[PDB]
Scaffold this active site. Sequence first.
Site, short mmCIF file in Angstrom:
data_model
loop_
_atom_site.label_atom_id
_atom_site.label_comp_id
_atom_site.label_asym_id
_atom_site.label_seq_id
_atom_site.Cartn_x
_atom_site.Cartn_y
_atom_site.Cartn_z
NE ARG A 27 3.48 29.41 22.05
CZ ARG A 27 4.84 29.62 21.81
NH1 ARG A 27 6.02 29.14 21.96
NH2 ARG A 27 5.71 31.14 21.88
CB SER A 57 12.05 40.66 14.31
OG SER A 57 13.02 39.79 14.37
CG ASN A 78 2.26 31.89 14.88
OD1 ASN A 78 1.20 31.49 14.42
ND2 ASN A 78 3.51 31.19 14.95
CB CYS A 131 4.31 36.95 16.39
SG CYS A 131 4.25 35.01 17.99
CB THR A 132 1.15 37.50 21.04
OG1 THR A 132 1.14 36.62 20.30
CG2 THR A 132 -0.49 38.09 21.67
CG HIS A 179 1.44 31.13 19.81
ND1 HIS A 179 1.37 32.84 19.90
CD2 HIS A 179 2.20 30.79 18.84
CE1 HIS A 179 2.14 32.67 18.90
NE2 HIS A 179 2.74 31.82 18.01
N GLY A 206 3.81 38.81 26.94
CA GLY A 206 3.88 39.63 27.05
C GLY A 206 3.18 41.23 26.46
NE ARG A 226 9.16 28.51 10.80
CZ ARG A 226 8.97 28.15 9.56
NH1 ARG A 226 10.03 27.24 8.79
NH2 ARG A 226 7.48 28.02 8.73
CB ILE A 227 10.71 36.19 11.71
CG1 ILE A 227 9.56 35.54 12.28
CG2 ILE A 227 10.31 37.56 10.46
CD1 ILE A 227 8.99 35.35 11.80
#
Lengths: 338, 338, 338, 338
Positions: free
Chosen positions: C239, C125, C320, C156-157, C183, C217, C12-13
């Site tokens: 989530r 990534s 995100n 992302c976070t 999220h 994390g 996806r990224i």
Amino acid sequence: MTVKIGINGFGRIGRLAFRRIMDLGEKSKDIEVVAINDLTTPALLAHLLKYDSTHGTFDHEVSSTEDSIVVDGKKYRVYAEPQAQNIPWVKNDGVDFVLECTGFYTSKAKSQAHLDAGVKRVLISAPAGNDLKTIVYSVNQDTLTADDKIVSAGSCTTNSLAPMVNALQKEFGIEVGTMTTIHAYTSTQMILDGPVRGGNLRAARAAAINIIPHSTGAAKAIGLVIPELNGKLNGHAQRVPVPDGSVTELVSILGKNVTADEVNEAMKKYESPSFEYEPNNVVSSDILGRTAGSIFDPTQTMVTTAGDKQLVKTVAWYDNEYSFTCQMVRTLLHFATL
Amino acid sequence: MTVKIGINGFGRIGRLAFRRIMDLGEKSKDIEVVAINDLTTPALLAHLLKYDSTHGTFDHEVSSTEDSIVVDGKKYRVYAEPQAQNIPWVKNDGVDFVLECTGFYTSKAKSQAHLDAGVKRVLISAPAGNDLKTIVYSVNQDTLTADDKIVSAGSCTTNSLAPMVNALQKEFGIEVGTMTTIHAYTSTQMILDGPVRGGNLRAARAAAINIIPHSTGAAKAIGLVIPELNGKLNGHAQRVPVPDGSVTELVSILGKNVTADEVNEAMKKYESPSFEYEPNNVVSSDILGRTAGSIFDPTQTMVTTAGDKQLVKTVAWYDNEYSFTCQMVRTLLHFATL
Amino acid sequence: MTVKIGINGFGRIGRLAFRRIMDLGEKSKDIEVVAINDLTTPALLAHLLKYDSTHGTFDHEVSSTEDSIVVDGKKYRVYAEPQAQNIPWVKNDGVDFVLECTGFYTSKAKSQAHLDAGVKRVLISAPAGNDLKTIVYSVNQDTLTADDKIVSAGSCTTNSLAPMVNALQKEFGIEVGTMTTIHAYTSTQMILDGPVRGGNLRAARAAAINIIPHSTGAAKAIGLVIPELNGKLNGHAQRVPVPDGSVTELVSILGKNVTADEVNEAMKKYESPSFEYEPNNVVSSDILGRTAGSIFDPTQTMVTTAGDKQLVKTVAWYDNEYSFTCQMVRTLLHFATL
Amino acid sequence: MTVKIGINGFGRIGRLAFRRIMDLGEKSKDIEVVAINDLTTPALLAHLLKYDSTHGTFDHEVSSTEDSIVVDGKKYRVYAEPQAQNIPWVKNDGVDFVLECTGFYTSKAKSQAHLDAGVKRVLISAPAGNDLKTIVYSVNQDTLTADDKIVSAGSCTTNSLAPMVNALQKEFGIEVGTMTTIHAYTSTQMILDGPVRGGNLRAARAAAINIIPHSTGAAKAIGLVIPELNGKLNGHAQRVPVPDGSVTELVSILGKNVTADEVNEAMKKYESPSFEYEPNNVVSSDILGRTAGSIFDPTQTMVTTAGDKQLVKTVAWYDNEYSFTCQMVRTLLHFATL
């Protein structure tokens, strides 16, 4: 004199079959699960037995050991054998019949491995070809004999469609028909768009935010269950964003001219534990936890007539998970009469 | 020489028509919105024009005054008249045609109030009876004359169905047919189960967690658009949990024996800005923002044959919001040729 | 003159990075994707590049060959090497830097395989340990030197949190803080309840019908990005059922007494392409497609004061997927200055 | 010997209170609903009592007459009085206490109308100002006296927060704290983006496809329930796409140094029917149907420490509908001791 069941694959259907069998055991039916075979950690399996996002919390104490799930202080052994002929549940636990839910044993030839372990009969929770019988309870279970060692339950969609088709065929005749099942998303669909095993361009798409067309085999395979309709039905599905709960529409040309009321009265005559008649203007949520294979909805019946031509639309709800499960459990009970 | 549009009711469709007209104005078409009439605060209307959860953010600067929405420094007057004959947008703003989106003016007799305000023609964004014309652009816009002052665009579902039906009728003949539209939930459905205006037992149910059957009028009303199919179609809907994006299935008996490929080639011949041919295995998300009224999907075409009988299933996608909107905007442009 | 990028893993990224790089290439930026490495059939990859349920349809012609994706007639080679040192994209395609998205190369030691293929630098990534630099563009990219061959982008976070934390730390000091990110569900969550790789009891649950707590994390790792806050932050996630779009709340004790307005003015001072200031009362849908790493929302800022004690809550939106992607692309551009 | 309840407003909460009271009546509790007042057609009300998309099908026969709901052959009168002082349920049906759920009677002064009809006490299902008592059962019900005729239950969120805050305050002291409740969408939110009564820019947005920030009063009003924390708490909400099931996070500075384990043991000491301790790694679906006001989750407890500073995060689930309902029913039982 209990029918003792071994479950191979403790996936969604296997777990619900466990729940269903325990519920029937409480209502005095002579059936119990004695053992499970699955490669997942028993603690994780126990937790998924206890908590389900669709079917609610199991009203029993559930825990686990290293090699078992524990329900209300009773141990259920979890074996972890990738090959069915190595599962020792016949001699250790008294397994009579196996509910085969793994996907790896979906043919007559593969599931014979259970018979090598001393299992009397296997019910496969999926369509499994045409060199064995496909049984939809309430429609053709009486075709089973003592010689039927490996049996298919068909699909969830076959068990929704066949009772309605059976009633229509007996009362009016079906000449030709086409199905669309508006169907809950399932566990093998993707949560977000990404590559899927097989490469299917639609199976790859985010399931809870799309209407997704999907190929089905339940209508084309109807001849396995009702031989006189072989080759007369076809259909497909639209996967939509509900987690469970489905509806099957059938558009037919019948051998006779009818009214909607006449069609509905005819379905009411075939009401049974496998085929419910539901006139109370329900929606999919109301269908969750239903035990019938097919829940006929007379409020959606439509007869469209123009000149000498007539199209008849009949609609059945189903809990694609639990309706299917309960149909299978009835078929496991039927195995004891063989 | 611009066609100047007044929008009565700045609801979802009105706002999208505003967006569509601005987009076409950028591509040099001679059409503009000059004024709006709506009882909601302009600031709230501006915000909903700018941000849409389904259609994305409008790529323009959007703000408001006490009595206007401002887009890229240009003022659009927001009147607040509950009675259409009191809106002064003809003399103040040069309104030629009104897009009537309020729900309060859904008949020939009611919408004549706009004509009392000096409006030349009204297009109602909903079915509005049978003493006026129902126009689906690309199918019957050429039936409009100089005398047609009040016109219905039909429903979103009529605009999905009619292009496909039109092609089938011209190429093969339709004898009888029945529709099911698997349809996005809409703004008048309930978020959670509760009483609904009218008392309908299904409209009362939580929309984003249910498959909900719903009555439709688009198939029974097809005779308004294609007179030779009057009384030959019927249908219904299943409301499912997507916020936008719908699909219309039609099962037909045709006047001729066909193959699926033959049907698909026939649809390809009628491709136009209103009727798209989409073979790329799309799902509902891919349809959002499409400008055609009906997006034919040849991958879902199915011909089921048994003996001398044949059933033909044809399937068209639509953005129930934007497909409908863009069909209406084409019809507003057509009004300038009258 | 162009920075040439190889993408390892077209998930996806990776696909969104492809889209982002092509968009920047259209706006003059001197950067292009020249090759991809991925084990999936190119036809499937091309289809997922073209159609995305969250990010819309890519506005380019997309097709494929046996070994390439084609975009607007230009070929992009898809290699299929499970081992990075065997990908020949440096000599064949001129790859300078690799975007490493596979999950299989998430350490300094593993990604060195790319360097064996002649790659100049790798951006991973994902968080990748602490013997390499973790870079959040706009916060610590200036710590990179010519010697930094393998770099982590964090998660992302981390990219949502660090800009906000950075501004707070410089203006006020942070003594201690705790994060909760509400999220979107992600691709490794389950669509329905079932066993998950690893055995996590919560990761096993149906993602689009549950609020699910999840360990993170990003706060505990903040010391990698802003060393003076090492050990001062912690957090977790909830989530929830949106497919994309997230929000990060931070509750802090600051080294100074503040007002909400003072906090919001301080964030406005650090506004940049990586850190947006968004006062327009947005919701998660409005955030989809945003290019900033962190979108500060001053409408949600709260200071709660009792006696001498003060808690400060600051809130940042992020896409995100795409916020993270665009941060990574800015970092790949920064590599050319080394 | 039975406490007899009249329900004013048969909305989601009123209906669930009806279900809850009938369930407790089956388990011996001396309480029953005797009458309802609501302007909706009884047939519609009966249908919504029977079928709920979140809480399942009521396991009783449900039908209606022109002026009653019928449950298992027993009639429950539905009056239709817009003014409470005109409802004759005290003399006709023996109503002792009224559950006031309409929204139209949310103050001490307005609900006195029930007292004019001969009602002994009113419990309002919403925050109702500060000239009456706000009662959260298990926290401050013992402040009620014989003189308390009109009482507020607070909100659903107050009932989730107060038990946890109470335990923390007694064991450790709270100096200051801030709440975020990640909360199910509710019936007054919009299904699709459109104007909302009041004009709130966020309340206007599509509820089942967005994370939406929302203002709350439950933390700022805590002083009504626990006077010593007046002015020490604040908070807000994030509305997310689940139809029911919520979670309340509190970040606190405590008057004492603690560990996570110490915090969790302290909560376990206050376990009761109103305040459950739930360590089994649950998600929101598992919380649906829970009868506690607040379900503490020790798996989410975090203490973050830096130097002499400490932040404590504690998390409680709740069924924002049924937890609230059951708290109210416990309070109606407490009224009989006055």
